[PDB]
Symmetry: C3
Subunit: 618 residues, 3 copies
RNA sequence: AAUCUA
């Protein structure tokens, strides 16, 4: 057991008592909250030609106050699993194509110490003490700002009064592997200092975990094969396809489909030559060698020539155009276009009672939104000309919706008369769809008449690094503004950051490298601030201020007087008449007093239909 | 952009603005309702040896687009109304795909906006036609879809929501070029056959106007169709070789009138397992699947040649004769109503269960709204267990579609203001075709056996079709309409024309046309032919039972209200209704408070009422 | 159309009327309750290398067939009672299928009618037997199934619903011809062993009469069995050659008492890899599965021969010795109650949480809550995470295994749970380590956690599993010798003949589930399996009593607290908000449950006293 | 999916 001190917090880490059959197990305890994290990795190679890592963070009695539920994973559990997955996936060795599952069990929760941060550290310790190949321990802390003071691992009470909710995962040598933040439109300088404080605290956790690894003997397994392309067949692919790929990536009038088809034309014209040259080569190895050669050729152009595949410099945006009031019956609407990415954002007002539901146990599972504000994000298969199932929601769609929701959350007004639901549908996808959902969402919010404090613009910052194979240190790098899909795919990170013209509201740094220096992170934040200014200026031309009032076809809430003698007929047997009227019409009726009822009509026409029934009944 | 005028209604078609990445995309707008339909088809052939076409119609709100909470909940992802609309769109566009187009195709419908006036389901069908027409996906001529209603004796094209609630007909017609009919799906309030037939002719006329507008939009756009990598149809030289190997043996099998479903299928499979192995030797390089489909083509042609040339079915009937129909009722004492309907080798078990009126409404508004209350307090659950075909399967879109059709058939004769919620359960114990239509006949018997005072008995039948078509002109030379088709005649036929009604009208219709459209003359004669069969079936059913029972069974449910004083309300109801909720789960009764002093109690059985009564008395 | 008389009950059995397309069909009727059971078996062999038998018992209504649920089946899914009934039917008919029958088989039960008096679950087992007997599916002799209850000290066959609610024993017996018990499943209210044993003897006598009636129906129908395309059993000459290679190596592994679960399995797999290559070159044309199953047969025979010949288990103990048992309580402060039970290499984490009495009522009370309400407000939730076996698996929802094991452990602890407890008792048993008996360890750990939580259970409950290794005549098929094993490991359950799980207090039996893999076993073997487990259970209760012998005098300080706060009538509208909006908002944001109990009284339930502070401030500020 | 906690 090792105790790590973090200011006024203490992190108790232990292993060797529970779940000893697993490849790796660890118990991380803070206060009275204990999380057991387990890592299991299969020994046989996976049929899939990639890393089949899955993280399942499960909560027992998932509610505020620990109400024991006792079928579906909660959205909070899904988001926590994605944060853990992003913290540990970069540190896995390349070619580790083995099925791996990390499971988090909430042994105890005291309602004071948040178990989500403990689960990330537990995943690090379980992997560190296991035989699973994994490069270096990571440390995860949460940084908040309470009354201008930075606090490490704030309690539940402190988090409720914090202007920042930032989670930092750090690697050895003060590297950063994961950033996930949501701020109440705080200054960039305050945001930058919180990352500096967080990275310092993760180093203390890392050296504590390293002490635990030193005490208990850890022998790493030897995988039967690491599925990385052979260097001698990678460099032969370079000879065949470098010139053709170079012309394609300097062909500045390509679009998304044309560039992809041109690359695939070279791939089909080179993969067959690779097969004859190396008959014994793995069929997947042939595929990955072309991906390796294409990726490095793509990045070499950016590093050497400071020019991108579509002919713009490292700091300029794509073509941005937007419009509002697309359709008459929508309460609010906006079509935001950025390059070849198109998002349709719709604002629908709802009754405040639609935020709560029946099944109060289920209601506490997903909670109640503080501002009665939610964002539903959809990524239809036709956005990328693909076939896919539309039932349910993906993990990626849930995560993208949460990021866009917390980007717009700081500017959403308090105590709005209606529940605000924003539906962002990605009609066309070429990268930064979630950030486009924030810009289009704010445009649609202003079009619907919601008096938001400021317009919110999001942007994605890419990164291309030259890393020496001798030590793994970064010597040169380029930061790209408003990256395309191919730049995210061939890049090192997807630094999605949103905010108003005077602050930052959300951040999600999806770093594919085993860690980046804090210097790069600071420069990416500054670079994104300038790009955010340009996007906001374009957005303000379409609409700069919220409309003076909501659309005339919007919802209306009015009270109806029902006498105590006639109320039996009004509600019927067990509320049958009220529920029947709420099904044939969208009107929601909720009793307020013994002689009055509150009627919410989604449209003025629905109000007329309901009013006819109320008079006829009474 | 092209505008099509359909009487007093206007249709707006546009493309090139939204979802430019999809193979095809279109926005269809009527009034303030706009629907975007996209069509994506893969380039590589699908591993499955058939057409993998899936239509997903999605709604962003419920109750005429007035429930914004609907698509917040990914749970309860799809409703029955969405499934039925997806099946309608699928039936309208599936027959127009080229034969052998084994490519994964998905058609997705997004409701951009709905005004609560114009119905988006018909616009979705037209949007699917435009998206496919403008795309590079190989697809035949444009399909126009309209809805025809009868309001105050007048035929209305694309009636609004208000007009639909007052119309005696809800008919959806999909038309191909040259006034062909691709899909028919109607629910009628027991209207006359002549009135029904006129609406089909009116609808076909209106669909041609839509096809004209879509054709102009296609002309303006530079639409170029892709060349598929391979169309998976058997080679003509292989089909012709299979013909001389198995035509005589298949002919003897289909002229043997002593075969049942299993014996005929086994005899056909015996020839298949004898000819396919010989096909491999003659064509070593042939695609293995091509061999399976070659025998299917030969068997289908031999099967149809007998009906056309000899006017005789495979079981010895003529074109108009029905199968043996036997009925039974009151088999089980505890069931409120029951009926066992047998038609040939098709056996359907129908059960009527009476429930409380409040049982039809869920505990939350959102789920209640998305799956709205039924027009009457009546629903039909349709089950197709795997053992009905001696198969193994998990315990469905097809069962939902069949149940909706059987519910549509029986809905017009269901009485109004019935004290209980009528729930009809149809279980296909044995399947040999027209199981859904047998569910309508058996359901009528079970409703009469349970004591439900239906206005008239309802019988349904399926009409087959066997055509000889010109290989060059594509025109129908001669055709045979078949009465009460078997399963094999559906499989080898051109359409499955399910139509139900009383002795004096038509209540439901669903034409599953597998041809690229059929002439309106064939449809009119199929309706007339089904009228003759419907009368004969109703005559047999009347022998088993001709009128509803004078009263419900003595074991049936009963409602009665008990008095609870205000002082005893706290003890009786309990903490937050806990005591009431415990009772309604133990004894099976349902207690609903109707006023301050009295509670209404519904008990499924008189014994269940006895159990709840004794427990209630000791508390009070 | 054959009627079987069982005392004052009748079993009407018929066929040839409904669902004639199925390979087998039968209608079994008792009183006014009728059940149709169908059996469909494919003719083409399954691509899998085992037996794909699935039983789906489906109901069309809940609460004795009062509230219909078939229409909502798409949304409500399969109820817990249906899953448990399917497992009982599966256990009754699975052992009688011939070895090597690798063909997809589905047995479907359709409840034609229920009168609320005769339970259809027993008729479904008999209907499965008749449907298989009259079908062409290769199946062994008919199986009769009865339920035995003890009402007022007398034994009742197939008790009604009214009688079952007054019975101290809910025992279901499935019997084979010649009085061979094939399935046992029971839940007793801490009854004596002598009374329990007599009920089994009575039940087997009644199942013989049903078998006689089914045999009469089969004879008059004229049933002809199909000939399977192939029975996938290893060739006798292939097995013999495998026994010439792996016999000595496997014998050394199983006589090496220093092994644990992982090392022993790794040692066996090392021999498996060595032998399979020699088998492949010796029999190149052999089925690749046949090579695999040949080693399994040889390894099973070597493993069992040591127990029979030498009376010693693979870990060195004797037939009656228990593995090491360690117990802990109060491992976490915030848990209302917790325990850590270890038995060899089987570790179970048991947690007790108290909720309000209204947490046992679902959302759709009229229809969803009808799927089940706990009698004593007590339930056990059993989880088997994939890392207990060091495996990877899907981890949302419960499979049939976890529902069955949780039901068994819940029934073991149910008799000792007190009555009129102020809170809803919820026990969660998570298997952290698995080496053969986790469901029984959930009963022991659950008893410890209940005492640690402060619940005054009548007595401690201990569960044990009894294995069985038999020597069977190749020609006659009669058992000539047998050994009963106490506290079996996973390897002994896998290579054994039965998984006899029984639990109870020091004075009686509370639960039983006999997972017999043989096609029936003599009643005397079952008789002394109960007796042997009585000795084993006594020793386990001695170890558990050392850790904790009596429940704690009071519940933990951080436990739930419930009391009522008065809300004035003039401001009740503000307190509840629009349509109870404020109450639901407070419940989601704090966790407290507020339920109106009078015209001015609201009962507040708080999971923790700290959360009650938050709620009390909220009520104070919102008046 | 279903056996299978080897
Ligand atoms: Mg077992
Ligand atoms: Mg077992």
């Amino acid at each position: 057991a090792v105790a790590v001190d973090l200011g006024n917090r203490k992190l108790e880490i232990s292993s060797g008592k529970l779940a000893r059959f697993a490849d790796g197990s660890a118990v991380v305890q803070s206060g009275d909250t204990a999380v057991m994290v387990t890592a299991v990795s299969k020994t046989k190679p996976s049929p899939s030609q990639f890393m089949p890592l899955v993280v399942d963070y499960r909560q027992k009695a998932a509610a505020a106050g620990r109400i024991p539920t006792n079928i579906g994973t909660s959205d909070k559990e899904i988001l926590t699993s994605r944060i853990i997955d992003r913290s540990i996936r970069p540190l896995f060795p390349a070619g580790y194509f083995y099925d791996t599952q990390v499971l988090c069990n909430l042994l105890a929760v005291d309602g004071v110490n948040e178990p989500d941060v403990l689960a990330i550290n537990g995943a690090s310790v379980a992997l560190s003490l296991s035989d699973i190949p994994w490069n270096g321990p990571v440390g995860a802390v949460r940084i908040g700002i309470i009354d201008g003071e930075y606090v490490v691992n704030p309690t539940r009470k402190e988090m409720s009064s914090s202007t920042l909710n930032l989670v930092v995962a750090g690697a050895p040598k003060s590297q950063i592997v994961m950033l996930e933040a949501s701020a109440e439109n705080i200054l960039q300088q305050d945001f930058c200092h919180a990352i500096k404080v967080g990275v310092k605290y993760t180093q203390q956790i890392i050296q504590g975990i390293q002490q635990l690894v030193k005490e208990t003997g850890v022998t790493k397994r030897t995988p039967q094969k690491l599925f990385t392309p052979s260097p001698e067949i990678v460099k032969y692919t370079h000879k065949l396809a470098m010139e053709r790929l170079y012309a394609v990536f300097t062909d500045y009038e390509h679009d998304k489909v044309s560039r992809d088809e041109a690359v695939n034309k070279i791939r089909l014209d080179t993969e067959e030559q690779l097969k004859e040259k190396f008959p014994e080569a793995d069929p997947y190895e042939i595929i990955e060698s072309f991906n390796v050669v294409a990726k490095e050729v793509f990045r070499s152009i950016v590093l050497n020539e400071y020019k991108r595949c579509d002919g713009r410099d490292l700091t300029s945006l794509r073509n941005v155009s937007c419009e509002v009031d697309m359709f008459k019956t929508l309460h609010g609407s906006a079509l935001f276009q950025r390059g070849q990415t198109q998002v349709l954002c719709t604002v629908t007002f709802d009754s405040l009672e639609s935020g709560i539901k029946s099944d109060q146990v289920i209601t506490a599972i997903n909670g109640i939104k503080d501002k009665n504000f939610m964002l539903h994000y959809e990524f239809p298969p036709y956005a990328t000309n693909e076939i896919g199932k539309v039932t349910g929601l993906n993990r990626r769609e849930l995560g993208h919706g949460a990021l866009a929701e917390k980007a717009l959350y700081p500017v959403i007004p308090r105590d709005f008369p209606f529940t605000i639901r924003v539906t962002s549908e990605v009609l066309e996808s070429n990268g930064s769809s979630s950030m486009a959902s924030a810009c289009g969402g704010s445009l649609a919010l202003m079009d619907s008449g919601v008096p938001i404090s400021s317009a919110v613009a999001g942007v994605a910052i890419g990164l291309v690094t030259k890393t020496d194979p001798e030590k793994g240190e970064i010597e040169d790098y380029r930061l790209l503004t408003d990256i395309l899909g191919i730049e995210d795919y061939n890049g090192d990170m997807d630094f999605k950051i949103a905010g108003t013209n005077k602050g930052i509201t959300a951040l999600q740094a999806d770093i594919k490298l085993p860690g980046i220096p804090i210097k790069i992170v600071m420069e990416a934040i500054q670079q994104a601030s300038v790009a955010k200014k340009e996007i906001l200026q374009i957005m303000n031309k379409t609409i700069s201020k919220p409309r003076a009032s909501r659309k005339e076809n919007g919802p209306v809430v009015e009270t109806v007087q029902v006498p105590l003698s006639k109320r039996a007929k009004f509600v019927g047997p067990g509320g049958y008449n009220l529920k029947k009227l709420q099904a044939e019409t969208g009107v929601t009726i909720s009793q307020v007093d013994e002689e009055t009822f509150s009627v919410f009509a989604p449209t003025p026409s629905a109000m007329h239909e309901a009013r006819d029934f109320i008079t006829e009944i009474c």
